[PDB]
Amino acid sequence: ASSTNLKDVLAALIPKEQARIKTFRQQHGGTALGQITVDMSYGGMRGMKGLVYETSVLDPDEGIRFRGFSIPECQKLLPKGGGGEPLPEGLFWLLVTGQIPTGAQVSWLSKEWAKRAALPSHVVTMLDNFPTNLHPMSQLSAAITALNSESNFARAYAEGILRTKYWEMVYESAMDLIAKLPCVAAKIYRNLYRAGSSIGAIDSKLDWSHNFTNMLGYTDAQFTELMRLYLTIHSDHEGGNVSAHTSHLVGSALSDPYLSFAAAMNGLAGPLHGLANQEVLGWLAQLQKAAGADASLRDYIWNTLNSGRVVPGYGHAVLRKTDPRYTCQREFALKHLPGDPMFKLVAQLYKIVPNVLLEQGAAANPWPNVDAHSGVLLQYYGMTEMNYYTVLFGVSRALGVLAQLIWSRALGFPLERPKSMSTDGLIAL
Amino acid sequence: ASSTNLKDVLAALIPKEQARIKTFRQQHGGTALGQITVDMSYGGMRGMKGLVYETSVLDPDEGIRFRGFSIPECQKLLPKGGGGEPLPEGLFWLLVTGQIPTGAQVSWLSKEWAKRAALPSHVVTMLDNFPTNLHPMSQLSAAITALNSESNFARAYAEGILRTKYWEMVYESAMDLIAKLPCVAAKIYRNLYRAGSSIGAIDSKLDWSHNFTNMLGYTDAQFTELMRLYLTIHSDHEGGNVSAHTSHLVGSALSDPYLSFAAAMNGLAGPLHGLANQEVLGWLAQLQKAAGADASLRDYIWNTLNSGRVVPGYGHAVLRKTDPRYTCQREFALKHLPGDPMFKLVAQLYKIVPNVLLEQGAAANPWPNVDAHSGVLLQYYGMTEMNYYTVLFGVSRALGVLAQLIWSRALGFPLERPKSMSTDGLIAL
Ligand SMILES: CC(C)(COP(=O)(O)OP(=O)(O)OC[C@H]1O[C@@H](n2cnc3c(N)ncnc32)[C@H](O)[C@@H]1OP(=O)(O)O)[C@@H](O)C(=O)NCCC(=O)NCCSCC[C@@](O)(CC(=O)O)C(=O)O
Ligand SMILES: CC(C)(COP(=O)(O)OP(=O)(O)OC[C@H]1O[C@@H](n2cnc3c(N)ncnc32)[C@H](O)[C@@H]1OP(=O)(O)O)[C@@H](O)C(=O)NCCC(=O)NCCSCC[C@@](O)(CC(=O)O)C(=O)O
């Protein structure tokens, strides 16, 4: 009998996986997977296999995979709006279950995130009172922190539930949080950039992305398509990235899903991390202030480098080739905004940057990453408020960090608490 | 010529250390320090030498050291109020410089944190508007996030400063943040537990701890002494603990010191982490509701265990013996509140718990940790609001996480971005 329910599927899923991880461990737990070097320790774990994260795997050459699903593969397999871009709802199912969803499942998440989208009074209040010089990421993070009041996992814990049921309450709070996100994010956008106006109502008949754009107040049918792709591609990037790892580290201590997410966001707000979104546009913005020749394009790049600054949008800790997330974006401008002068610049930089970075001989990866291409796309659509970009990243990333978080707790992952050493202590070792 | 200035000392300190770390690396960077096992990956990095953290080192047997300074050693070497407990100001100097401060230096930090203690209007406003069912840690974290508006490092970055000067702005923001902390924390305390009253003014002639207690509204001369010790002992606990590591991870991305600290706090708010502060008291509180015999004390313990719950205040990821931080606390009750019935219970549990935990055969470390002893002490003094304890932990921990943070940036530590794997991926390895 009956219909669609993710929680029920997971219930079926958990015990098998649990069983699966036990025997593997019983046999291989002692297996050395790697070594740790001094350089590794001073180098921010660069190269260190430190975590188990199941939702996605980053390949140094090919890049990110969702099951073992590449972006191009997701693009063709994931249910769409009616209607060329993959629905983030579907990416979510996929990340959660390892399986490709049916349009039917896809519709369930949509309704689900629609029914659940509700902002408590104390949150609206705070956001309403936030100064305008308060960065959108800051506002975003305080808000999510402030929502913790509402944690089903926090309450259940306080009640004394057995550890075995953790995942259950994590799941509820993950679904609620995902659902509330576009409301919080839009409210900040409305406050800061459209003072006096209102977010409106969520309509149970639309997909999440669509209700989001409606809340942001964008009408362009192509903008909606942008959104769906954007929120899908930004989902998840394995576990080692600052935002995902922070949520993983914080969640490990038993802090509810709200608290872990907001810390994840303080992470994404960093310039070398998500903020590159924004830094890229302000660097272009500045570029243009100072139709240029490659030679002047190259002088500009050197001065950045020479000034002990980074060239935003290039480089990666794990990727060693152009980010397929970059290509994905380029192919979208190519279809939709090929004559855009910002676009062209971005295309022009592609030709120069890497070569200049190779020339400098410092960057291990001279290729662009996802952040080099995102904003260009947004600006075209009339969303030119650059200090807001990372919020968009923010909302998407939730899909991936909450998908895994529920697994961690399902699998009983323990407290993340490695050993640290001092230089003296290492000198002595 | 001239007088005391920490920043100047550091300026002298950085280049030597920098030079010191380079040659070491030039010679030993390739040196394997350890291996990584499958169990390690599923086990939250348990046993993994993953980070360089210079301010403190946790020994599995002896416990925490500040230089190479033990708590008992700090207790005798650190300048005091007039006047038995070590001043957290001095611990700070010590953590920052590796050297024991003079009373004269100690006085400088005090004035310094006094001159700098100032809360912007948008912060007071938010805290004032926070609901009372909003946990104090949540309020604490949102507030610190909200202060980021004020980041000297954030502004300097946005201006395009060379990487080499990072530490300079980090230092300023660390000093400002440390200074503002007791104001934020007290304001929450005043709001929630003393509605209508006010935090008052900071007096440049007192030590930080003293102005703190004044802001909390405690008069007891022994309470002040409590505070100083409390804030000193909670300072730092090497780099691998959830709060310290989170600040380290987030700071690595270039998020300012405000944002990194607040994420650190979402970490400390976890039940297996700082929240144990609170969980302990509510477990005792419940214990007493249900002068008991060891046998009933032991039935009580088993029911906790049997219910898939933890016994708060016992156990540690790295320590394998009683936490000297626990002993420190016990010796304080012994001097000051030896007949307190809560105290006695806590003494009684010491005799039972571990034995029961040994009986169960699960905990690697059956001994109590710092959190098992803290609240008992607070409650005696009339600070019986248990949901506030972790805030106290909060304020102290800043001393250690900001001390190192300035070093990280001084030493140019890179982005913390390890490799993650999936189970499939490991199964395949
Ligand atoms: C990304 C980045 C931090 C990688 O750091 P890394 O692994 O330590 O880099 P590296 O090439 O090994 O570093 C060697 C040297 O090259 C320098 N270098 C690297 N990239 C750059 C750059 N774009 N400009 C100038 N110099 C650079 C490094 O700063 C370093 O300098 P020093 O030895 O004096 O510090 C670095 O390339 C950079 O700072 N880029 C500029 C900022 C930027 O574009 N940030 C984008 C990050 S993408 C965010 C998301 C992610 O893809 C992240 C992930 O998976 O981790 C995800 O979805 O979550
Ligand atoms: C502290 C703690 C998480 C260590 O976790 P761990 O290293 O994974 O522990 P372990 O002994 O290796 O775990 C083996 C098994 O024993 C169980 N066990 C350990 N402690 C307890 C306990 N108190 N009660 C019941 N069972 C326990 C573990 O849960 C685990 O169970 P499963 O295999 O079914 O999960 C664990 O002992 C615990 O949950 N304790 C109860 C909560 C508590 O007292 N928290 C206090 C943490 S101190 C905070 C601060 C710190 O000292 C932290 C630091 O340095 O990291 C600092 O200053 O920052």
XYZ file of N, CA and C in Angstrom, chain A residues 17 20-21 24-25 28-39 41-46 48-54 57-58 122 126 130-131 133-134 138 141-142 145-146 148-149 157 160-163 237-242 245-246 249-250 252-255 259 262-263 266-267 269-273 279 307-310 316-318 413-424 426-427 429, chain B residues 17 20-21 24-25 28-39 41-46 48-54 57-58 122 126 130-131 133-134 138 141-142 145-146 148-149 157 160-163 237-242 245-246 249-250 252-255 259 262-263 266-267 269-273 279 307-310 316-318 413-424 426-427 429:
582
model
N 23.575 -0.261 5.527
C 24.814 0.472 5.464
C 25.667 0.288 6.722
N 27.072 -2.959 6.596
C 28.070 -2.864 5.562
C 29.351 -2.233 6.061
N 29.227 -1.129 6.783
C 30.416 -0.522 7.347
C 31.021 -1.414 8.434
N 33.263 -4.277 6.971
C 34.422 -3.712 6.286
C 35.512 -3.375 7.290
N 35.054 -2.765 8.380
C 35.937 -2.331 9.439
C 36.548 -3.485 10.206
N 39.216 -4.480 7.840
C 40.179 -3.508 7.344
C 40.505 -2.283 8.209
N 39.820 -2.146 9.345
C 40.043 -1.038 10.264
C 41.517 -0.699 10.485
N 42.373 -1.710 10.428
C 43.762 -1.505 10.768
C 44.663 -1.157 9.612
N 44.006 -1.172 8.465
C 44.635 -0.930 7.205
C 45.080 0.500 7.111
N 46.378 0.653 6.842
C 46.904 1.981 6.634
C 46.528 2.382 5.230
N 45.996 3.598 5.151
C 45.482 4.281 3.973
C 46.413 5.383 3.516
N 47.288 5.763 4.432
C 48.213 6.841 4.164
C 49.170 7.119 5.315
N 50.067 8.057 5.035
C 50.998 8.582 6.003
C 50.754 10.071 6.127
N 51.279 10.585 7.232
C 51.203 11.977 7.614
C 52.613 12.540 7.680
N 52.832 13.643 6.962
C 54.137 14.285 6.949
C 54.104 15.601 7.711
N 55.289 16.121 7.993
C 55.448 17.397 8.672
C 54.804 18.482 7.783
N 55.111 18.410 6.492
C 54.543 19.368 5.592
C 53.041 19.337 5.525
N 51.100 18.631 8.064
C 50.648 19.283 9.274
C 50.656 20.809 9.184
N 51.710 21.404 8.607
C 51.858 22.847 8.391
C 51.077 23.311 7.160
N 50.736 22.318 6.346
C 50.046 22.609 5.098
C 48.522 22.468 5.100
N 47.859 22.588 6.246
C 46.410 22.510 6.268
C 45.830 21.183 5.784
N 46.472 20.093 6.185
C 46.026 18.756 5.844
C 46.061 18.451 4.352
N 46.755 19.298 3.591
C 46.833 19.130 2.155
C 47.317 17.750 1.827
N 45.954 15.009 2.991
C 45.610 14.051 4.028
C 44.201 13.470 3.886
N 44.049 12.135 3.878
C 42.773 11.405 3.849
C 42.300 11.379 5.287
N 41.476 12.351 5.594
C 41.093 12.511 6.962
C 39.668 12.156 7.347
N 38.706 12.183 6.415
C 37.289 12.000 6.716
C 36.553 11.048 5.809
N 35.445 10.508 6.331
C 34.509 9.733 5.529
C 33.287 10.599 5.269
N 33.000 10.790 3.990
C 31.907 11.675 3.619
C 31.246 11.021 2.445
N 29.985 10.728 2.594
C 29.509 9.846 1.577
C 28.791 10.388 0.388
N 32.247 12.711 -4.071
C 33.690 12.492 -4.103
C 34.346 13.367 -5.143
N 35.333 14.140 -4.687
C 36.100 15.029 -5.557
C 37.339 14.343 -6.108
N 10.805 35.771 16.218
C 12.015 36.354 16.744
C 13.105 36.476 15.697
N 14.760 40.143 14.225
C 16.167 40.392 14.229
C 16.667 40.873 12.874
N 18.549 44.445 11.706
C 19.957 44.426 11.318
C 20.366 45.630 10.514
N 21.524 46.144 10.860
C 22.021 47.304 10.166
C 22.301 46.938 8.718
N 25.002 47.856 7.033
C 26.421 47.604 6.843
C 26.758 46.243 7.452
N 25.742 45.442 7.723
C 26.043 44.129 8.264
C 26.030 43.161 7.098
N 26.809 37.462 7.302
C 26.714 37.628 8.740
C 25.274 37.573 9.130
N 24.096 33.890 8.839
C 24.595 33.082 9.929
C 23.932 33.397 11.254
N 23.801 34.674 11.627
C 23.137 34.942 12.908
C 21.724 34.391 12.912
N 21.551 30.611 13.321
C 21.900 30.359 14.715
C 20.648 30.583 15.572
N 20.066 31.792 15.469
C 18.833 32.203 16.137
C 17.657 31.247 15.955
N 17.780 28.014 16.043
C 18.036 26.823 16.842
C 17.024 26.529 17.943
N 16.339 27.589 18.408
C 15.186 27.710 19.321
C 14.143 26.652 18.997
N 17.199 15.468 22.374
C 18.446 15.256 23.107
C 18.282 15.597 24.583
N 16.587 13.215 26.328
C 17.237 11.967 26.696
C 17.007 10.786 25.748
N 16.759 11.023 24.451
C 16.594 9.931 23.490
C 17.866 9.097 23.364
N 17.638 7.841 23.070
C 18.689 6.889 22.840
C 19.493 7.364 21.631
N 20.840 7.173 21.561
C 21.656 7.607 20.399
C 21.224 7.070 19.053
N 30.605 19.428 -2.197
C 31.919 19.318 -2.787
C 32.823 18.495 -1.887
N 32.376 17.262 -1.732
C 32.999 16.336 -0.833
C 33.097 16.939 0.563
N 33.787 16.250 1.472
C 33.795 16.643 2.869
C 34.890 17.543 3.409
N 36.006 17.607 2.692
C 37.171 18.357 3.106
C 37.123 19.863 2.947
N 36.167 20.395 2.172
C 36.071 21.844 1.991
C 35.669 22.486 3.305
N 36.183 23.664 3.546
C 35.923 24.349 4.794
C 34.479 24.337 5.308
N 33.361 20.552 5.965
C 34.068 20.048 7.135
C 33.640 20.713 8.439
N 33.408 22.022 8.401
C 33.013 22.677 9.629
C 31.668 22.122 10.124
N 32.437 18.717 11.669
C 33.147 18.889 12.937
C 32.201 19.304 14.061
N 31.398 20.329 13.807
C 30.429 20.840 14.755
C 29.282 19.860 14.988
N 29.432 16.743 14.922
C 30.040 15.620 15.628
C 29.948 15.739 17.139
N 29.798 16.962 17.592
C 29.729 17.238 18.998
C 28.315 17.180 19.521
N 27.382 16.997 18.604
C 25.969 16.938 18.914
C 25.166 18.234 18.890
N 25.823 19.275 18.415
C 25.139 20.508 18.199
C 24.154 20.213 17.092
N 22.805 25.097 14.360
C 24.115 25.524 14.825
C 25.231 25.034 13.928
N 25.088 27.168 10.556
C 25.567 28.546 10.709
C 27.097 28.620 10.831
N 27.728 27.624 11.452
C 29.174 27.654 11.556
C 29.724 27.355 10.184
N 30.029 30.643 8.416
C 31.123 31.527 8.867
C 32.397 31.130 8.113
N 32.345 29.850 7.711
C 33.387 29.209 6.903
C 33.351 29.617 5.435
N 31.897 32.168 4.390
C 32.119 33.593 4.291
C 33.579 33.939 4.102
N 34.476 32.966 4.199
C 35.886 33.334 4.065
C 36.314 33.629 2.627
N 37.160 34.639 2.397
C 37.630 34.977 1.051
C 38.259 33.870 0.210
N 38.979 32.964 0.853
C 39.582 31.873 0.118
C 38.553 30.783 -0.068
N 37.391 30.926 0.555
C 36.370 29.911 0.423
C 35.206 30.429 -0.403
N 34.375 38.282 -4.351
C 35.648 38.897 -4.597
C 35.944 39.002 -6.076
N 51.258 42.613 -5.139
C 50.692 43.256 -3.957
C 50.345 42.291 -2.796
N 50.798 41.040 -2.894
C 50.567 40.040 -1.869
C 49.098 39.694 -1.675
N 48.369 39.663 -2.802
C 46.934 39.395 -2.899
C 46.653 38.190 -3.775
N 45.456 37.652 -3.701
C 45.198 36.549 -4.584
C 44.266 37.009 -5.688
N 42.714 25.881 -6.424
C 41.969 24.884 -5.666
C 42.913 23.987 -4.880
N 42.424 23.563 -3.731
C 43.183 22.688 -2.869
C 43.239 21.274 -3.400
N 42.239 20.856 -4.159
C 42.261 19.467 -4.602
C 42.228 19.338 -6.119
N 28.788 8.245 13.525
C 30.164 8.768 13.533
C 30.423 9.488 14.859
N 31.569 9.242 15.506
C 31.997 9.866 16.763
C 32.494 11.311 16.649
N 32.885 11.834 17.804
C 33.436 13.163 17.928
C 34.712 13.295 17.117
N 34.806 14.375 16.330
C 35.983 14.631 15.508
C 36.982 15.361 16.376
N 38.042 14.658 16.702
C 38.965 15.192 17.662
C 40.327 14.598 17.419
N 41.017 15.219 16.481
C 42.349 14.756 16.164
C 43.348 15.275 17.205
N 44.602 14.838 17.049
C 45.780 15.263 17.808
C 46.485 16.458 17.114
N 46.920 17.433 17.915
C 47.643 18.605 17.442
C 48.984 18.590 18.118
N 49.921 19.256 17.493
C 51.245 19.290 18.039
C 51.708 20.709 17.953
N 52.759 21.026 18.684
C 53.346 22.347 18.574
C 54.625 22.196 17.756
N 55.183 23.310 17.338
C 56.411 23.214 16.602
C 57.535 22.577 17.416
N 57.608 22.945 18.702
C 58.620 22.437 19.603
C 58.528 20.945 19.661
N 56.991 19.084 17.611
C 57.311 18.351 16.412
C 58.834 18.263 16.260
N 59.506 19.394 16.532
C 60.957 19.489 16.518
C 61.524 18.335 17.347
N 59.838 15.422 18.125
C 59.444 14.091 17.670
C 60.531 13.243 16.989
N 60.453 32.996 14.497
C 59.678 31.783 14.433
C 59.476 31.294 12.997
N 62.544 29.910 11.897
C 62.649 28.674 12.629
C 61.826 27.570 12.006
N 60.584 27.878 11.657
C 59.774 26.880 10.990
C 60.316 26.585 9.589
N 63.298 24.041 9.620
C 62.849 22.741 10.110
C 62.193 21.954 8.987
N 61.358 22.683 8.252
C 60.609 22.111 7.156
C 61.484 21.726 5.982
N 62.866 18.529 7.239
C 61.990 17.468 7.711
C 60.565 17.380 7.147
N 60.189 18.340 6.301
C 58.872 18.366 5.683
C 58.387 17.002 5.190
N 59.318 16.164 4.757
C 58.940 14.914 4.141
C 58.837 13.738 5.078
N 59.189 14.069 6.308
C 59.235 13.129 7.384
C 57.849 12.672 7.735
N 57.682 11.349 7.695
C 56.418 10.784 8.105
C 56.416 10.775 9.613
N 55.299 11.266 10.143
C 54.976 11.449 11.550
C 53.967 10.428 12.029
N 53.306 9.825 11.054
C 52.273 8.861 11.352
C 51.645 8.242 10.110
N 50.751 7.301 10.390
C 49.934 6.657 9.391
C 48.483 6.923 9.731
N 47.669 6.707 8.705
C 46.234 6.879 8.737
C 45.579 5.535 8.465
N 44.684 5.133 9.368
C 43.978 3.869 9.216
C 42.517 4.101 8.864
N 41.862 3.031 8.436
C 40.448 3.055 8.102
C 39.673 3.440 9.379
N 40.051 2.802 10.483
C 39.394 3.111 11.718
C 39.544 4.542 12.155
N 39.710 7.086 10.103
C 38.803 7.840 9.265
C 37.353 7.806 9.749
N 36.855 6.636 10.174
C 35.508 6.433 10.719
C 35.428 6.861 12.186
N 36.617 6.976 12.767
C 36.702 7.311 14.181
C 36.940 8.783 14.531
N 36.577 9.724 13.667
C 36.747 11.128 13.995
C 38.189 11.561 14.243
N 39.095 11.050 13.418
C 40.501 11.393 13.496
C 41.174 10.965 14.793
N 40.503 10.093 15.549
C 41.027 9.640 16.820
C 42.409 9.088 16.636
N 44.848 10.715 15.178
C 45.531 11.323 14.048
C 46.223 12.645 14.386
N 47.523 12.791 14.080
C 48.322 14.016 14.239
C 48.012 14.852 13.016
N 47.053 15.727 13.197
C 46.575 16.457 12.065
C 46.916 17.933 11.977
N 47.193 18.616 13.097
C 47.390 20.062 13.130
C 48.590 20.534 13.910
N 49.053 21.741 13.565
C 50.069 22.434 14.345
C 49.383 23.542 15.128
N 49.545 23.480 16.441
C 48.860 24.435 17.299
C 49.836 24.763 18.386
N 50.167 26.019 18.492
C 51.309 26.212 19.327
C 51.139 26.588 20.759
N 49.802 22.073 24.638
C 49.922 20.673 24.242
C 49.299 19.764 25.272
N 48.370 18.931 24.800
C 47.682 17.960 25.649
C 48.400 16.621 25.664
N 23.843 48.073 17.334
C 23.064 47.044 16.690
C 23.139 45.716 17.417
N 19.866 43.724 19.332
C 19.529 42.367 19.035
C 19.376 41.527 20.295
N 16.102 39.397 21.845
C 16.123 37.936 21.842
C 15.139 37.327 22.803
N 14.476 36.301 22.321
C 13.501 35.636 23.147
C 14.204 34.984 24.325
N 13.565 31.932 25.445
C 13.760 30.514 25.193
C 14.893 30.353 24.181
N 15.666 31.405 23.977
C 16.774 31.260 23.050
C 18.006 30.966 23.882
N 23.398 30.279 21.987
C 22.876 30.750 20.719
C 22.928 32.242 20.709
N 26.634 33.308 20.306
C 27.103 33.116 18.953
C 26.505 34.105 17.973
N 25.188 34.327 17.996
C 24.647 35.306 17.045
C 25.274 36.671 17.257
N 28.826 36.953 15.922
C 28.690 36.985 14.470
C 28.340 38.418 14.052
N 27.241 38.950 14.614
C 26.758 40.315 14.417
C 27.807 41.402 14.634
N 30.893 41.313 13.667
C 31.821 41.280 12.543
C 31.893 42.547 11.700
N 30.798 43.328 11.722
C 30.526 44.682 11.199
C 31.701 45.604 11.488
N 41.417 43.569 4.612
C 41.349 42.560 3.555
C 40.655 43.108 2.315
N 42.622 45.207 0.495
C 43.688 44.680 -0.343
C 45.084 44.653 0.285
N 45.204 44.550 1.617
C 46.514 44.456 2.265
C 47.263 43.198 1.838
N 48.566 43.342 1.837
C 49.470 42.269 1.531
C 49.267 41.174 2.576
N 49.377 39.857 2.247
C 49.200 38.762 3.234
C 50.090 38.824 4.454
N 42.957 24.140 25.088
C 43.124 22.717 25.273
C 43.626 22.084 23.988
N 44.806 22.559 23.632
C 45.427 22.197 22.392
C 44.483 22.470 21.228
N 44.868 22.046 20.025
C 44.132 22.407 18.826
C 43.051 21.492 18.282
N 43.097 20.226 18.681
C 42.189 19.210 18.197
C 40.780 19.212 18.755
N 40.530 19.929 19.861
C 39.185 19.971 20.437
C 38.258 20.705 19.487
N 37.025 20.270 19.442
C 36.063 20.849 18.529
C 36.042 22.378 18.416
N 39.601 23.636 17.090
C 39.741 23.265 15.689
C 38.795 24.020 14.761
N 37.558 24.232 15.202
C 36.640 24.936 14.333
C 37.141 26.366 14.070
N 39.978 26.038 11.537
C 39.440 25.687 10.222
C 38.817 26.896 9.527
N 37.948 27.602 10.239
C 37.279 28.786 9.740
C 38.243 29.956 9.557
N 41.256 29.799 8.757
C 42.117 29.402 7.648
C 41.623 29.889 6.298
N 40.338 30.151 6.238
C 39.718 30.589 5.020
C 39.737 32.091 4.879
N 40.211 32.749 5.923
C 40.285 34.193 5.979
C 39.096 34.959 6.549
N 38.168 34.199 7.098
C 37.081 34.799 7.800
C 37.715 35.457 9.002
N 33.794 36.027 13.178
C 33.174 34.886 12.524
C 33.800 33.573 12.944
N 32.612 32.817 16.681
C 31.211 32.393 16.780
C 31.005 30.950 16.296
N 31.764 30.506 15.294
C 31.610 29.139 14.836
C 32.211 28.247 15.893
N 29.470 27.480 18.327
C 28.428 26.542 17.862
C 28.917 25.115 18.134
N 30.257 25.061 18.183
C 31.010 23.844 18.499
C 30.994 23.490 19.981
N 28.900 24.611 21.998
C 27.535 24.368 22.410
C 27.150 22.910 22.304
N 28.003 22.073 21.728
C 27.586 20.677 21.591
C 27.640 19.884 22.896
N 26.667 19.005 23.161
C 26.652 18.195 24.382
C 27.892 17.369 24.712
N 28.553 16.845 23.690
C 29.751 16.072 23.932
C 30.920 17.016 24.080
N 30.702 18.302 23.835
C 31.784 19.254 23.949
C 31.575 20.157 25.152
N 25.066 19.902 31.111
C 24.449 18.607 31.177
C 24.704 17.931 32.505
N 19.938 3.403 28.678
C 19.056 4.260 27.894
C 19.714 4.903 26.647
N 20.914 4.442 26.293
C 21.633 4.938 25.133
C 22.017 6.406 25.237
N 22.385 6.811 26.463
C 22.766 8.171 26.849
C 24.170 8.212 27.417
N 24.752 9.388 27.511
C 26.058 9.405 28.107
C 25.960 10.011 29.494
N 36.987 11.333 27.633
C 37.805 12.254 26.855
C 38.406 11.553 25.646
N 38.555 12.328 24.590
C 39.127 11.826 23.364
C 40.622 11.634 23.470
N 41.287 12.399 24.321
C 42.739 12.263 24.360
C 43.252 11.894 25.746
N 49.852 30.066 7.975
C 49.253 28.740 7.754
C 48.202 28.839 6.645
N 48.196 27.905 5.686
C 47.244 27.824 4.573
C 45.846 27.312 4.933
N 45.019 27.239 3.897
C 43.669 26.738 3.993
C 43.662 25.292 4.457
N 42.814 24.992 5.449
C 42.697 23.640 5.981
C 41.703 22.904 5.112
N 42.226 21.969 4.353
C 41.403 21.332 3.365
C 41.946 19.954 3.087
N 41.539 19.040 3.947
C 41.975 17.673 3.779
C 41.141 16.984 2.693
N 41.517 15.734 2.403
C 40.833 14.797 1.508
C 39.809 13.931 2.290
N 38.634 13.722 1.691
C 37.576 12.897 2.256
C 37.326 11.783 1.281
N 36.779 10.713 1.800
C 36.518 9.581 0.963
C 35.139 9.109 1.299
N 34.576 8.287 0.434
C 33.289 7.690 0.737
C 33.557 6.241 1.130
N 32.550 5.590 1.672
C 32.747 4.211 2.017
C 33.078 3.343 0.804
N 32.389 3.612 -0.312
C 32.580 2.875 -1.543
C 34.011 2.981 -1.968
N 36.434 3.926 -0.161
C 37.424 3.301 0.679
C 37.444 1.793 0.409
N 36.239 1.215 0.282
C 36.052 -0.189 -0.050
C 36.914 -0.514 -1.270
N 39.640 1.322 -2.333
C 41.067 1.584 -2.161
C 41.984 0.357 -2.029
